[PDB]
């Protein structure tokens, strides 16, 4: 048979647990960035990226325009995210 795809299949740790989440490019750049990574969350996830924080390998990503692959997330990887989700009453 025959598989591929271009987005990447990469989890997201934010609640002590595990969300895998599908990034994909920004229907226009070659490949995807850490831009879509960041939006893939708050658009699955629900928390915004000035809640949500990327780390890995003990680096804050803080970089959208980088390249996934240079931080070195690729498809089958596990990045941690740091942040509050929306949980709790809440009126205003």
Same mark, same amino acid.
């Given at each position: &048979?025959?598989? /591929?795809?271009?987005?990447?299949?990469?989890?997201?740790?934010?609640?002590? @647990?595990?969300?895998?989440?599908?990034?994909?490019?920004?229907? &226009?750049?070659? @490949?995807?960035v850490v831009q879509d990574l960041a939006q893939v969350v708050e658009?699955? +996830? /629900?928390?915004?990226?000035?809640?949500?924080?990327? +780390?890995?390998? &003990?680096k804050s990503l803080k970089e959208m325009e980088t390249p996934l692959s240079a931080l070195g997330i690729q498809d089958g990887c596990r990045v941690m995210l740091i942040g509050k989700k929306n949980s709790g009453p809440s009126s205003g």
């Open positions: &048979g025959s598989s /591929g795809s271009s987005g990447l299949t990469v989890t997201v740790t934010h609640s002590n @647990e595990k969300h895998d989440l599908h990034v994909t490019s920004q229907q &226009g750049s070659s @490949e995807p658009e699955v +996830i /629900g928390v915004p990226q000035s809640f949500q924080k990327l +780390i890995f390998k &003990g």
